Design a protein around this ligand. Structure first.
Ligand SMILES: [K+]
Ligand SMILES: [K+]
Ligand SMILES: [Mg+2]
Ligand SMILES: [Mg+2]
Ligand SMILES: [Mg+2]
Ligand code: NA
Lengths: 129, 42, 85, 198, 92, 150
RNA sequence: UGUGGCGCGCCGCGGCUUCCAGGAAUGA
RNA sequence: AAACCAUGACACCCAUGAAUUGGGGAACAUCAUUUUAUUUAUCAAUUUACGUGCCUACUCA
């Protein structure tokens, strides 16, 4: 059965961008999925997306602009101390010049660059570049 | 027995109120009837 | 054929052929009918996919036959579909 | 005076002009109308509010009433609003029930005990249903633009277009005034297949 | 079975007696609506019950099972050779 | 996939988005409650009550009018079944299979199916004991279960 | 201005009595 | 056991043309009797079209 909604959604987006599609449909939706997409959109990696209501878990349609190379989830959600950001950047990112690691902290869901500014650790959710 | 006693007491309490304190509102229906019956003017 | 498909606003033809529960928003396939049997001038509401035994209030005779899918009405009866809302 | 029985007990001592005017119309409607003659003697309103904007030249009149009478009002609506509009030219009359909202607690144990009718999401969507009541929502979408802006759109059945389209710009203003949230409206011919009118 | 379902309904909202002696008692008093006889009944005891029912104008249903099956159809752990229904409840 | 098989079946009903009852119903909430209680008196399960209302009296859902579910209505009126309906229907099927196996001792296919049904029963009973719908220390036994069933 | 659409309106009654909490539950 | 698909179970995405086995819908047969729109268009507001053979001098609408 399906055990992770976030992992399912990120696999659908990465698969569609590999095939050069313009839109992708994601089902089911969740609060964590929407927050993850808002971080990607703020940095300019996807574009506009829309949520459709069906009185159950919703559906999401995402528009892709072709700037996203790969996104993925990290399972299980390992803890990350504020001094451990460099270790994760070295392991799962193409370089130290671009790309983001997404964390869930007591201040909310954010990328690793913002978390370093606020000096907070948390649990690693995923990445995109 | 203690559980039964408390249950019986609650039933009496729900019977005292919602039957006596409520349905007392015949006081205001009497006042409303008086207003409609009165004020005949003429 | 120059028009491109939008996933959030499907065309009439594309959405018309889809299985229910495969549409963008799932919904029913059935409806209700206003059936008048021959005699007794009575009007009764019948489900389209009715599998139980349906009889008029007075005549106490069968009004439809259960099948796989849509029920079949007795020969003497006529029906009018009722509005959704 | 007998017409003051249509106001809540606290407002009876020193009523406002708008509340007094509405109360007078309701009492006259009590003994005059045929359908409204029943189910009216059990009804009384809380307060009356008025809103307007430089655009939407018509004026909005909002009437709030206790939540107990929601079943009473539902059967009576589509007629009470028609007669009230006749006696108040230049105004559009809206009936909304007064509801309470429980602030979201922080403990997980406290959250499990919250009554779901007092949730903010549930309350706001019920206020929307109190507006445009004879019609119903056939769809709802949220749009997230490239900038942080977020929009909510509500679709109505296109069969009621002739009877509700004139009041849509004013009803969105009232919804914003009561909930501090913005809503956009659209019409859907064939809601089963999600076809948007144009 | 059709008869098995009706017996369950009577067990829930009706009146009845189980046994030969009590069934004959209700037949004499004329408060019997239906008598169910198992296939296991001894031939001379069955002949007596049928004669009583003809005198009292009471219908008879011949059960297909034996007294072991009839007893379990009433939610019982024992056997019953005959069942007499005195008050059909929300049943038929 | 099915719990105890290899089938991938998708057949099911799809509830509508609009929950308000149609304007032509003209049936009060009290009338619906009365019709539900009458059928339960006749001895019908909650599933069969819903189909009978849907097929003949034009009520699509008993929750959209009266705001209550069918089993909740029966519990309030005190006419709820002693054990859950789905559990009862499984016990009845196992009883019929055992009766057939008494005469036919070479039916290895039926013995296999009996294993699956009894496994389903024990899983169902475990859930109902946890949510306190069955009394604790309630057990299913093949010898006793012949009673208390159709 | 006026035209054209506008929606609402344009076993029945009767006094008394006793009993009665039985509609507030996220969605499927 | 070459107990073999020499390929563990559950779940998601996935391009194309001919076929096939079971069920259902449309059709056949049986009964019954939106605005608009003079000056338009960026991803359409309706591609839903179509007949044959057998058939009471009944496991059959
Ligand atoms: K081996
Ligand atoms: K097959
Ligand atoms: Mg398994
Ligand atoms: Mg389900
Ligand atoms: Mg091997
Ligand atoms: Na092989």
């Amino acid at each position: 059965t399906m055990m992770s909604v976030l992992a399912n959604a990120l696999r659908c987006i990465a698969g569609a961008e590999r095939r050069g599609k313009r839109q992708v449909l994601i089902r089911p939706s969740s609060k964590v999925v929407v927050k993850f997409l808002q971080v990607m959109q703020k940095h300019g990696y996807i574009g506009e997306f829309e949520i459709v209501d069906d009185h159950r878990a919703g559906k999401i349609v995402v528009n892709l602009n072709g700037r996203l190379n790969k996104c993925g989830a990290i399972c299980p959600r390992f803890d990350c101390t504020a001094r451990d950001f460099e270790k994760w950047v070295k392991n799962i990112l193409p370089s130290r010049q671009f790309g983001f690691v997404v964390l869930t902290t007591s201040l909310g869901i954010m990328d690793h660059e913002e978390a370093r500014a606020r000096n907070t650790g948390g649990k690693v959710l995923g990445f995109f570049y | 027995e203690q559980l039964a006693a408390k249950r019986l007491k609650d039933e009496q309490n729900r019977r005292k109120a919602r039957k006596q304190e409520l349905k007392k509102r015949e006081k205001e229906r009497e006042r409303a009837r008086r207003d409609d019956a009165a004020a005949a003017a003429a | 054929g120059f028009f491109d498909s939008d996933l959030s606003y499907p065309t009439v033809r594309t959405e018309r052929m889809k299985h229910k529960r495969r549409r963008l928003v799932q919904g029913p396939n059935s409806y209700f009918m206003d059936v008048k049997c021959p005699g007794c001038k009575n009007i009764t509401v019948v489900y389209s996919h009715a599998t139980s035994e349906v009889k008029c209030n007075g005549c106490a005779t069968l009004l439809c036959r259960p099948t796989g899918g849509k029920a079949m009405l007795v020969t003497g009866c006529g029906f009018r579909k009722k509005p959704d809302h | 005076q007998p017409h003051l029985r249509k106001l809540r007990k606290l407002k009876r001592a020193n009523p406002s002009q708008e509340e007094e005017s509405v109360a007078r119309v309701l009492f006259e409607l009590e003994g005059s109308h045929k359908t409204l003659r029943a189910q009216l003697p059990r009804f009384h309103i809380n307060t009356v509010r008025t809103s307007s904007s430089p655009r939407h030249k018509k004026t909005a009149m909002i009437i709030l009433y206790p939540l107990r009478f929601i079943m009473l009002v539902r059967k009576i609506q589509r007629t009470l609003t028609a007669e009230l509009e006749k006696r108040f030219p230049g105004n559009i009359v809206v009936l909304v029930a007064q509801r309470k909202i429980t602030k979201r607690p922080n403990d997980v144990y406290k959250l499990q005990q919250v009554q779901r009718s007092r949730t903010s999401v549930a309350v706001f969507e019920n206020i929307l249903n109190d507006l445009i009541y004879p019609c119903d929502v056939v769809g709802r979408r949220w749009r997230y633009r490239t900038d942080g802006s977020k929009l909510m759109k509500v679709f109505l059945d296109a069969r009621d277009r002739k009877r509700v389209e004139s009041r849509l710009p004013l009803l969105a203003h009232v919804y914003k005034l009561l909930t501090h949230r913005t809503v956009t409206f659209g019409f859907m011919w064939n809601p089963k297949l999600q076809q948007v009118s144009s | 079975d059709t008869i098995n379902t009706k017996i369950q309904l009577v067990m829930k909202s009706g009146k009845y007696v189980l046994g030969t002696q009590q069934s004959l008692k209700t037949l004499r008093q004329g408060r019997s609506k239906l008598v169910v006889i198992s296939a296991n009944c001894p031939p001379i005891r069955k002949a007596e019950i049928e004669y009583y029912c003809t005198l009292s104008k009471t219908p008879i249903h011949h059960y297909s099972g034996n007294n072991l099956d009839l007893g379990t159809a009433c939610g019982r752990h024992f056997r019953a050779c005959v069942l007499s229904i005195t008050d059909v409840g929300d049943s038929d | 996939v099915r719990m105890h098989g290899n089938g991938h079946g998708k057949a099911a009903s799809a509830l509508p988005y609009r929950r308000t009852p149609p304007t032509w119903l003209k049936s009060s909430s009290r009338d619906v409650i009365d019709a539900v209680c009458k059928l339960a008196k006749k001895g019908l399960s909650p599933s069969r009550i819903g189909m009978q209302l849907r097929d003949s009296m034009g009520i699509a859902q008993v929750k959209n009018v009266t705001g209550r579910k069918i089993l909740r209505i029966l519990k309030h009126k005190g006419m709820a079944p002693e054990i859950p309906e789905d559990l009862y229907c499984l016990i009845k099927r196992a009883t019929q299979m055992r009766k057939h196996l008494e005469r036919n001792t070479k039916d290895k296919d039926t013995k296999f199916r009996l294993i699956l049904v009894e496994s389903r029963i024990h899983r169902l009973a475990r859930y109902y004991r946890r949510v306190k719908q069955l009394p604790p220390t309630w057990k299913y036994e093949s010898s006793t279960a012949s009673a208390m069933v159709a």
